[PDB]
Amino acid sequence: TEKLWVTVYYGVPVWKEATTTLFCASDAKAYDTEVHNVWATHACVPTDPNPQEVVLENVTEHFNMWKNNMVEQMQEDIISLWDQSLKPCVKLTPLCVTLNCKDVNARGEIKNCSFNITTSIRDEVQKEYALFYKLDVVPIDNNNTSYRLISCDTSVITQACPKISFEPIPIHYCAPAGFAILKCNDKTFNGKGPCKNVSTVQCTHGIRPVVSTQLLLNGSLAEEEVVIRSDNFTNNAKTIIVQLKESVEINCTRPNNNTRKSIHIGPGRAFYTTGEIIGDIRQAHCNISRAKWNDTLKQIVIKLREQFENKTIVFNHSSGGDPEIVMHSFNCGGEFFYCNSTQLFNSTWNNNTTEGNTITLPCRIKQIINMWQEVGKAMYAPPIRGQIRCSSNITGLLLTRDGGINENGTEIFRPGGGDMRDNWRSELYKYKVVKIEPLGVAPTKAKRAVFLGFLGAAGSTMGAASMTLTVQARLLLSGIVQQQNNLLRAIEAQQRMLQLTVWGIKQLQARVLAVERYLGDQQLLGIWGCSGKLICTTAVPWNASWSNKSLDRIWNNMTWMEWEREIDNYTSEIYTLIEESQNQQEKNEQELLEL
Amino acid sequence: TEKLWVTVYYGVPVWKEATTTLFCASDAKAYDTEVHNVWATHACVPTDPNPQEVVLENVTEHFNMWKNNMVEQMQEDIISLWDQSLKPCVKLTPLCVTLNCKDVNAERGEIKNCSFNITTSIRDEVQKEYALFYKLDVVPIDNNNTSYRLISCDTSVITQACPKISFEPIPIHYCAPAGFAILKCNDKTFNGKGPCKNVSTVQCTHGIRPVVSTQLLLNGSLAEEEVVIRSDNFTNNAKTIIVQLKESVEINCTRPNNNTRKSIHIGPGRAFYTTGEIIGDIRQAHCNISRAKWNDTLKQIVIKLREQFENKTIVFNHSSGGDPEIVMHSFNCGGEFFYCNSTQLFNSTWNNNTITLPCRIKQIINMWQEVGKAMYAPPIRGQIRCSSNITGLLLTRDGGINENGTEIFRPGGGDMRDNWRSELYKYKVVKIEPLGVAPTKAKRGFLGAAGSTMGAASMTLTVQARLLLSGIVQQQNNLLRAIEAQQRMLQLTVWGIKQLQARVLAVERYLGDQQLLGIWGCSGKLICTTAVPWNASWSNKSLDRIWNNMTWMEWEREIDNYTSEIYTLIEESQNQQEKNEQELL
Amino acid sequence: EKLWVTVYYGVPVWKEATTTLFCASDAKAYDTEVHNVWATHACVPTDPNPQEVVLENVTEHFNMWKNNMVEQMQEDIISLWDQSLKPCVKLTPLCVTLNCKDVNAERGEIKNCSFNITTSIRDEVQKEYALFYKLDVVPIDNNNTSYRLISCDTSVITQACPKISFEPIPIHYCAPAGFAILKCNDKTFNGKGPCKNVSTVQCTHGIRPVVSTQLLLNGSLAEEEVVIRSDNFTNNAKTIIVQLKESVEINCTRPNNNTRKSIHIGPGRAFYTTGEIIGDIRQAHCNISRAKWNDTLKQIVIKLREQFENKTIVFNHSSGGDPEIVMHSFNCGGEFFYCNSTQLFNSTWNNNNTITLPCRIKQIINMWQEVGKAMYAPPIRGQIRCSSNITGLLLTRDGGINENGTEIFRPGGGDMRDNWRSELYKYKVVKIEPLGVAPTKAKRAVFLGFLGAAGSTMGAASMTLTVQARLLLSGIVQQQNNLLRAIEAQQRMLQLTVWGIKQLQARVLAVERYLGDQQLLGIWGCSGKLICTTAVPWNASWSNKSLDRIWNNMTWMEWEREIDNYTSEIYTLIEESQNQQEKNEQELLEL
Numbered sequence A: 001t002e003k004l005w006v007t008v009y010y011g012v013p014v015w016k017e018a019t020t021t022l023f024c025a026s027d028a029k030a031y032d033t034e035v036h037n038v039w040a041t042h043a044c045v046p047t048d049p050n051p052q053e054v055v056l057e058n059v060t061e062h063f064n065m066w067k068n069n070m071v072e073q074m075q076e077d078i079i080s081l082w083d084q085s086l087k088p089c090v091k092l093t094p095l096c097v098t099l100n101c102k103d104v105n106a107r108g109e110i111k112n113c114s115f116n117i118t119t120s121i122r123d124e125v126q127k128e129y130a131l132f133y134k135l136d137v138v139p140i141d142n143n144n145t146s147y148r149l150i151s152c153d154t155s156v157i158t159q160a161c162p163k164i165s166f167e168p169i170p171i172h173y174c175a176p177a178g179f180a181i182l183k184c185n186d187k188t189f190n191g192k193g194p195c196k197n198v199s200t201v202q203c204t205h206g207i208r209p210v211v212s213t214q215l216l217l218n219g220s221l222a223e224e225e226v227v228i229r230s231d232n233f234t235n236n237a238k239t240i241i242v243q244l245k246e247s248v249e250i251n252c253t254r255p256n257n258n259t260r261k262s263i264h265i266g267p268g269r270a271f272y273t274t275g276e277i278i279g280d281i282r283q284a285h286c287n288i289s290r291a292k293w294n295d296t297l298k299q300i301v302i303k304l305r306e307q308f309e310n311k312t313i314v315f316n317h318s319s320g321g322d323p324e325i326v327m328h329s330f331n332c333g334g335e336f337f338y339c340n341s342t343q344l345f346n347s348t349w350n351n352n353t354t355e356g357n358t359i360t361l362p363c364r365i366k367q368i369i370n371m372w373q374e375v376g377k378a379m380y381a382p383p384i385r386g387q388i389r390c391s392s393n394i395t396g397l398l399l400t401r402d403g404g405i406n407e408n409g410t411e412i413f414r415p416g417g418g419d420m421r422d423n424w425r426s427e428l429y430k431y432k433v434v435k436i437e438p439l440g441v442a443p444t445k446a447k448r449a450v451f452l453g454f455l456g457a458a459g460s461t462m463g464a465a466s467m468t469l470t471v472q473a474r475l476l477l478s479g480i481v482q483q484q485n486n487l488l489r490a491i492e493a494q495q496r497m498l499q500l501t502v503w504g505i506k507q508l509q510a511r512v513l514a515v516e517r518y519l520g521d522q523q524l525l526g527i528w529g530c531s532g533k534l535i536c537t538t539a540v541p542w543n544a545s546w547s548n549k550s551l552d553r554i555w556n557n558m559t560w561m562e563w564e565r566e567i568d569n570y571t572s573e574i575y576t577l578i579e580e581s582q583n584q585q586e587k588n589e590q591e592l593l594e595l
Numbered sequence B: 001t002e003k004l005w006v007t008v009y010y011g012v013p014v015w016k017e018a019t020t021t022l023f024c025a026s027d028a029k030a031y032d033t034e035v036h037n038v039w040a041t042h043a044c045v046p047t048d049p050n051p052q053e054v055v056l057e058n059v060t061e062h063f064n065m066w067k068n069n070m071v072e073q074m075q076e077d078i079i080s081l082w083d084q085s086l087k088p089c090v091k092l093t094p095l096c097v098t099l100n101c102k103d104v105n106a107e108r109g110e111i112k113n114c115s116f117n118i119t120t121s122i123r124d125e126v127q128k129e130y131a132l133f134y135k136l137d138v139v140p141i142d143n144n145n146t147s148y149r150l151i152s153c154d155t156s157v158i159t160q161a162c163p164k165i166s167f168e169p170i171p172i173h174y175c176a177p178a179g180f181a182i183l184k185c186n187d188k189t190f191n192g193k194g195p196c197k198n199v200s201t202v203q204c205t206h207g208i209r210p211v212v213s214t215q216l217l218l219n220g221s222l223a224e225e226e227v228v229i230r231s232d233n234f235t236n237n238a239k240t241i242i243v244q245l246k247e248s249v250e251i252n253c254t255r256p257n258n259n260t261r262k263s264i265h266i267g268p269g270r271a272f273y274t275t276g277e278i279i280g281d282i283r284q285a286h287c288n289i290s291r292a293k294w295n296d297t298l299k300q301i302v303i304k305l306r307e308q309f310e311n312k313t314i315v316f317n318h319s320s321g322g323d324p325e326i327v328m329h330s331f332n333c334g335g336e337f338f339y340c341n342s343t344q345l346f347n348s349t350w351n352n353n354t355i356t357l358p359c360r361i362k363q364i365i366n367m368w369q370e371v372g373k374a375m376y377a378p379p380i381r382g383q384i385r386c387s388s389n390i391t392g393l394l395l396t397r398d399g400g401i402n403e404n405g406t407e408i409f410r411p412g413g414g415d416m417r418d419n420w421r422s423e424l425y426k427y428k429v430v431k432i433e434p435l436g437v438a439p440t441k442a443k444r445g446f447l448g449a450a451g452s453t454m455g456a457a458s459m460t461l462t463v464q465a466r467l468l469l470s471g472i473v474q475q476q477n478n479l480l481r482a483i484e485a486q487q488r489m490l491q492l493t494v495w496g497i498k499q500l501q502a503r504v505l506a507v508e509r510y511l512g513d514q515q516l517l518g519i520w521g522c523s524g525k526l527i528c529t530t531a532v533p534w535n536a537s538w539s540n541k542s543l544d545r546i547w548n549n550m551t552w553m554e555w556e557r558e559i560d561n562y563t564s565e566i567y568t569l570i571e572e573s574q575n576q577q578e579k580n581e582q583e584l585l
Numbered sequence C: 001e002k003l004w005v006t007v008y009y010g011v012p013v014w015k016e017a018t019t020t021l022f023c024a025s026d027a028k029a030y031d032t033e034v035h036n037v038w039a040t041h042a043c044v045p046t047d048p049n050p051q052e053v054v055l056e057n058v059t060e061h062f063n064m065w066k067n068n069m070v071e072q073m074q075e076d077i078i079s080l081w082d083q084s085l086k087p088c089v090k091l092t093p094l095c096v097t098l099n100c101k102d103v104n105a106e107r108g109e110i111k112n113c114s115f116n117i118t119t120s121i122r123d124e125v126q127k128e129y130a131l132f133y134k135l136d137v138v139p140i141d142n143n144n145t146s147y148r149l150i151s152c153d154t155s156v157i158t159q160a161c162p163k164i165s166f167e168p169i170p171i172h173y174c175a176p177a178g179f180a181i182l183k184c185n186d187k188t189f190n191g192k193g194p195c196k197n198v199s200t201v202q203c204t205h206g207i208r209p210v211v212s213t214q215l216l217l218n219g220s221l222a223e224e225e226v227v228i229r230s231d232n233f234t235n236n237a238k239t240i241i242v243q244l245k246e247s248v249e250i251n252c253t254r255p256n257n258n259t260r261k262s263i264h265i266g267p268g269r270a271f272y273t274t275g276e277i278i279g280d281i282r283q284a285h286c287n288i289s290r291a292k293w294n295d296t297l298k299q300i301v302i303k304l305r306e307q308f309e310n311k312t313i314v315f316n317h318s319s320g321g322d323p324e325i326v327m328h329s330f331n332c333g334g335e336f337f338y339c340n341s342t343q344l345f346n347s348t349w350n351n352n353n354t355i356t357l358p359c360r361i362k363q364i365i366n367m368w369q370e371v372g373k374a375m376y377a378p379p380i381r382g383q384i385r386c387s388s389n390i391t392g393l394l395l396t397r398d399g400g401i402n403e404n405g406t407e408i409f410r411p412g413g414g415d416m417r418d419n420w421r422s423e424l425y426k427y428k429v430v431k432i433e434p435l436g437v438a439p440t441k442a443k444r445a446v447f448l449g450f451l452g453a454a455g456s457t458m459g460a461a462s463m464t465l466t467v468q469a470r471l472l473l474s475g476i477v478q479q480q481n482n483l484l485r486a487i488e489a490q491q492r493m494l495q496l497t498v499w500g501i502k503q504l505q506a507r508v509l510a511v512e513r514y515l516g517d518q519q520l521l522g523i524w525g526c527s528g529k530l531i532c533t534t535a536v537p538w539n540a541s542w543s544n545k546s547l548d549r550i551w552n553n554m555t556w557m558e559w560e561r562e563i564d565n566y567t568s569e570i571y572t573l574i575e576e577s578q579n580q581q582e583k584n585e586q587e588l589l590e591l
């Protein structure tokens, strides 16, 4: 009552949005390993499966799609994970020399090359027999036969180590302690904004690291019907994403059986190019029936008619520039296929207001692959002693708006390509992470049979949120190491090269940042003069300068998220005045305990 | 009362496995201002203060000590040490060079003068030098081409050894962090997977010197009095067979070769030490050893071998051909690479006087496993005169057809992981779980780990639990010079890194224990008693047998192996009640 | 009686120890996008308002030649320059001979030089004109057309990293926990002996990296009586350090409008040099105010003849030796400066306007320490001015025997270490650890005034003043810059930087002290308050101290330090006897 002796609270189920370093999870990568060269590309600790997942149904929150910081780290992580890969790999340094080449017909784009190379200490190789594609050389000296080397002006002599494999792994992702990822269990709800049905998630689903253009290889389904996600404010001038309800696999073909042919170059230097092919090569294709795709295009216009009153729907092909963006990068088999999709949008959509049931697409894989965000450091891959038929279900799409005005109601959808980020935004569009301040403080009250939610206490009955505070901490910050409890030193602590990892050093950074909160909290608990108690009734009465509500209403329906920001005017204010009076207690009995 | 009233027993002596990298320790008299120059370890920077241990014998358990987790750390660790020293070393540019070799004054297969042709690094002068090199470490083609190519130049790079650093194996006491026990067994005769009556826990190992083996165990510790194999191996003939040894054997092996050094510059900061001229004699490295003792050992061997083979007829045959280094014995004293042809040592047959061994040396060493890493031997002047202790062997069931006496051993050189497995079979690393609650029927300095009911022996391990981070007690790491030796040179990040990684594990394990202390409102006092009823759904047994007939180990094994929810269930019983005494007081 | 022991946790125990150095940036006033590796692109911002407490009653010797923190910090800048050069490129193909011409006249100073090369892999040859000095080119074959770089024949050579600069940011060296920094506010303190007027500060003041040789600029002015420092005045082979209360500015600038040429080496390498010249060039001359330079030399021989009277001191130059030593090395904003000190020491000064400095510029910079590596300096476009105050000098004493008895002095220099010794005369960091016991005959305000308070008193205020010290032990935002938790969210960066290594260094050891403190709180005293932690057993037969409470009324904590030589084991004997009570209180609760 009016005694108003304000009382601290430890472990209050509250949260603040914060951005801190992530954490990974690899039960499945720890479940099997043929060779650790993918683990060299993708190293992570297991996570003890069947994790706990809890629903918080009574509190909506504003989800901010397109603008979460969790996008930013995971993209810059993987580039660094691409950096560790290329550190031991050799640099193809003398290679921007001239080329004499003659074209080979089986098509018409495959060309062998032999030239006066000085590759080793000795052995001037001139019978060099090196087969290349049209797309992997720059045509120079067109009357002569020079015709070579796309990007050797810049630092592109990096190449792939042949023993290293590239097959992506579904990787779950967790958080360091004191942080919890929020998962909206509403269904495909918007492209930006809040949602009611939500939940906490400790560790997300698995994500294969996959990058493709205008196209969603091995993606994630939509349990609803087809949905769209946009920003819808600069909608006229911004590429947005498309999510598909069902999926279609596409089996994509084999050129022919192939040969590796190590060429003597130097110290660790022996790369590969094809000198032999078993038989006569067939044109690479990705095989699919039109009719299922014919079904999908109608489903698009349904979403288009939801946005547009009655606009015409047109599909031209995108412009000539950015050829990797124009085509479709299929990186399956560790091999970077590109396929012409001009056989896809011959049809523009008829406003309604089997001739070719199936379709295969013309394809050319490239042998040299460039870093996209800057100029320099292209990645070279060696050929395979084989021919690969990969297949992947396709679950989404990326398209441009193509903004303008031409015939007043007719707008075109040329296809839309992007960066690696927007590939990775899409699956993460149901996940946001917050931090935990377990401490709270509210004035006193009158008088001095289930598992519960982590945030359902803040979800509903914030007055009756007075219980279960401890177990809300025992998974989230407490148990500093909740990932593989006992802190399993495992196939990450086992068999790690150099002991200088992106993960473990950050993991070293992780657990230290865990405790200095908790200890520094408990420092502050000692500064508050009490530890080991959830509450501590303290010796200032609540001055009503801060608020004017009644006692019962606060223990009625007042959300913690409400109640924290009402008292955010007096954050350090309500801190300092009681601890100094607690320090005034400290100057009372200390002089008394001298005698 | 008859109800289960549970109450915390902190510090109950229970162990359970955990894989964890651990501490090391070395003598303070060993370093001699050359922590780096002795070997890559910086002579194991944390000191070895005291061996003060106790031995802990109540009962035996089969800790199946054959399969072992410690080794995999250590064999990873050693490779981390060898690239560590070799990283500031410099590469070799003249890799695949012709180098027409000639020998001085005809013994054959030796060092060849190879007339080193080179143009230097960035300058433009075709020079000629004196390349004095073995037949072994180099390869020509076609017997008319003097294309003496380097044996690994097509494979990978090669680098000089930074020759200030020597190659001495240091007796190192591999210790452990907090909450960790190193199991050992003073009972004799246990072969890998075994139990052990005379059993004990230590905090540090003895001063192990892990160095080099092809098939023989060198400078290793002795066995029991009976020369008996103490490993577990399946009866498949492809399973490798180690054996220990009682009688230490000592062999004189030396160089009749008094070479000089020569430095050859190529590039900036790149002068290359090579073999100079040899003073005086040029004879082959050999190994004097008494075969009568080898006769005396071999008789003592086969009797135990006939005992484990139901009186089979064992005949030793010389091993098959193959790799140069698996077959011929790369044994390395003085940091040089003796290869010894053991064709004198298995012309031997069984049914019911100073042998001298001709040897030879190659320079260039690869990893057997990762094909990208090669190491070059620096020339050292003088003549190497050193020996060894010999206390173990490794062979294999060969596997011929049964028209023989049904046992042939043709020896085999193997993987390195074997060589740490060779001694740690009597070792095991376990983790300690001072947590524990038993139902206690009440409505709210001898030895560390033994007994069935702890009168106060749990408190003894709390003293070990308060060896956590005292900063002053010499037993843990003393954290006084150990706290200062790391902070000076932590930039090395090879050896002190795991130490500070051990600090990481040291705190948060303890801190989570410090949490779960304060989580249940226990706040020390070792008891933390609660008036919470618990049903006999878990146990309808006499409480008295639970006290004394059984310990708390097997009681934890029996019913507690699953009741991990009781932690949460005693949490909420606290959590509700603490709110109740908050709400009522 | 008296129980002969009580625990008394918080007691100020100053104690010499060497821990890892800690520091923070003050780029908060700068916020430069340019990294400037010394600036660390703002490691961590500093405290605006620290507090400083002077302890008057303490005297203590502080050797200013046995500091660890100098060479540690000297090691740091060496390691700092490692993370500078290791990103950018080395001049590996550029180590070849070259034919060179003089542009005009001066008189052979500036050298336009030419060479056939293919820094490209695309297999061409052409002559590459480039503009140089006489100062960096070795002549070959009777000084004919053959020329090379002086360096690169031994060391390895890199290009300096173009996007950053070479400006020192004053920074506050500091301490996380336990240990702290000391200052002595008295004067004429050569670095030996004790001193009074002693303070302690948590951090340091803003300290800029001093790098120049034979010259001391932008540093400690210390405006009291002119003092001089050296190690051992018996030995002539000791460095003689000058402090001056006055600050002579010296303006020095580029006498040349110049441009940049960027020679494309190859893929992302792209060497930078000077493009051209606008007009003619001079030798970057400088002004000293010779009359003040007349004045300064009058001031210094006073204290010199105060130390050694009737010694007719004459100035001499150094012999022809090492160019780092014999010349004034100098940096200000980029390039390097080498001015002749010959025009100083024609003066003698035995008994009683403007100036010119011909100056030189070395492009290549070899390894100061031993041999290993070398650095190339690319030029900067346009003219650059620099005027800077001079605070001090380094000198030496010759050793040849005079029958005139003259003390001949010549320029002393050639150690990057002593630039750090130049500032750290006042500064010492000792461990402070809160533990200390006392047999007390009990019934059985100044802020951070630790040693001003006495072990004689050990007063009730001395108790609460260590309560202030355990207020220092806990860290949150703005009590602690590492536990400034706003920067902790900002610190998403990699910690592979040496400074980031210092972060993960200093934080955990601060914790495990505070843990190891908190580990020993309960097991020793079983109390939160430091006094009521008491022990019964009468250490008389083995503490063995012929004293009393009335002796303790006039004592000190160094007595307790002398007690530690005798009783260090007795704490463990106390602690097992401390264990004796709760093992008998256990059987009260056991049965």
Ligand SMILES: *[C@@H]1O[C@H](CO)[C@@H](O[C@@H]2O[C@H](CO)[C@@H](O[C@@H]3O[C@H](CO)[C@@H](O)[C@H](O)[C@@H]3O)[C@H](O)[C@H]2NC(C)=O)[C@H](O)[C@H]1NC(C)=O
Residues within 6 Å of the ligand: A316, A317, A406, A412
């Ligand atoms: C997709 O839509 C775009 C425009 O909405 C079409 O681009 C148009 O292509 C035609 C054919 O080349 C262009 O016609 C020519 O234009 C030039 C320059 O204006 C003119 O001099 C010629 O006489 C001829 O008319 C037209 O300009 C161009 N429009 C734009 C805006 O670029 C494209 O053809 C459509 N895709 C398909 C498959 O039809």
Ligand SMILES: *[C@@H]1O[C@H](CO)[C@@H](O[C@@H]2O[C@H](CO)[C@@H](O[C@@H]3O[C@H](CO)[C@@H](O)[C@H](O)[C@@H]3O)[C@H](O)[C@H]2NC(C)=O)[C@H](O)[C@H]1NC(C)=O
Residues within 6 Å of the ligand: C314, C315, C316, C317, C318, C319, C408
């Ligand atoms: C400053 O320091 C220099 C270097 O120590 C002193 O140079 C020395 O000057 C004397 C006086 O001329 C030289 O003596 C000469 O010796 C030759 C050969 O015996 C003789 O032919 C001359 O007549 C004269 O006696 C001495 O060689 C020279 N030494 C060096 C190393 O330069 C100089 O005297 C000092 N001056 C002052 C004012 O301190």
Ligand SMILES: *[C@@H]1O[C@H](CO)[C@@H](O[C@@H]2O[C@H](CO)[C@@H](O[C@@H]3O[C@H](CO)[C@@H](O)[C@H](O)[C@@H]3O)[C@H](O)[C@H]2NC(C)=O)[C@H](O)[C@H]1NC(C)=O
Residues within 6 Å of the ligand: C251, C252, C253, C286, C287, C354, C355
């Ligand atoms: C530092 O002080 C010196 C003086 O000791 C300054 O040098 C003086 O600079 C002026 C202007 O640059 C010179 O005057 C010029 O003389 C030439 C030749 O007669 C004339 O053609 C010009 O129009 C101008 O009148 C003066 O001769 C020169 N004297 C000396 C002794 O150096 C110097 O500029 C000062 N530097 C700074 C940064 O303050």
Ligand SMILES: *[C@@H]1O[C@H](CO)[C@@H](O[C@@H]2O[C@H](CO)[C@@H](O)[C@H](O)[C@H]2NC(C)=O)[C@H](O)[C@H]1NC(C)=O
Residues within 6 Å of the ligand: A104, A112, A113, A114, A126, A127, A128, A129, A130, A131, A275
């Ligand atoms: C590419 O061209 C090269 C050279 O024109 C071909 O290499 C020749 O192969 C035949 C047998 O396969 C040899 O007899 C010749 O000696 C080779 N040439 C040289 C210069 O040695 C190569 O077969 C051609 N490959 C393709 C796929 O077109």
Ligand SMILES: *[C@@H]1O[C@H](CO)[C@@H](O[C@@H]2O[C@H](CO)[C@@H](O)[C@H](O)[C@H]2NC(C)=O)[C@H](O)[C@H]1NC(C)=O
Residues within 6 Å of the ligand: A054, A055, A056, A185, A186, A187, A197, A198, A199
């Ligand atoms: C709200 O999210 C919850 C999960 O947080 C969803 O709960 C699932 O609901 C279905 C249908 O009742 C059950 O099959 C599942 O077992 C429920 N999961 C759990 C955790 O209980 C619910 O479907 C969501 N609602 C919306 C509209 O998507």
Ligand SMILES: *[C@@H]1O[C@H](CO)[C@@H](O[C@@H]2O[C@H](CO)[C@@H](O)[C@H](O)[C@H]2NC(C)=O)[C@H](O)[C@H]1NC(C)=O
Residues within 6 Å of the ligand: B535, B537, B538
């Ligand atoms: C006494 O023990 C039994 C057996 O463990 C408990 O039965 C469990 O009760 C929960 C609900 O509280 C059920 O969800 C479980 O399925 C039951 N277990 C089994 C094996 O059927 C019983 O609850 C315990 N009694 C009390 C009062 O806690």
Ligand SMILES: *[C@@H]1O[C@H](CO)[C@@H](O[C@@H]2O[C@H](CO)[C@@H](O)[C@H](O)[C@H]2NC(C)=O)[C@H](O)[C@H]1NC(C)=O
Residues within 6 Å of the ligand: C250, C251, C287, C288, C289, C387
């Ligand atoms: C050296 O040059 C500096 C740079 O101009 C001179 O400093 C100037 O001094 C005058 C007179 O005191 C002032 O009016 C200017 O404001 C100062 N400007 C700057 C930028 O400092 C300095 O006086 C010169 N000294 C000598 C000895 O030449």
Ligand SMILES: *[C@@H]1O[C@H](CO)[C@@H](O)[C@H](O)[C@H]1NC(C)=O
Residues within 6 Å of the ligand: A556, A557
């Ligand atoms: C609980 O809060 C809601 C939200 O304002 C309100 O509508 C409702 O009336 C409250 N309950 C009572 C009993 O007033």
Ligand SMILES: *[C@@H]1O[C@H](CO)[C@@H](O)[C@H](O)[C@H]1NC(C)=O
Residues within 6 Å of the ligand: B303, B306, B307, B310, B311, B351, B352
């Ligand atoms: C057979 O083994 C027994 C011991 O089991 C031994 O007494 C006897 O000597 C053995 N015979 C052979 C031939 O070794």
Ligand SMILES: *[C@@H]1O[C@H](CO)[C@@H](O)[C@H](O)[C@H]1NC(C)=O
Residues within 6 Å of the ligand: C055, C056, C057, C058, C196, C197
């Ligand atoms: C020393 O301490 C005394 C008090 O004991 C004080 O009066 C005196 O001023 C102090 N002297 C200084 C400043 O060191």
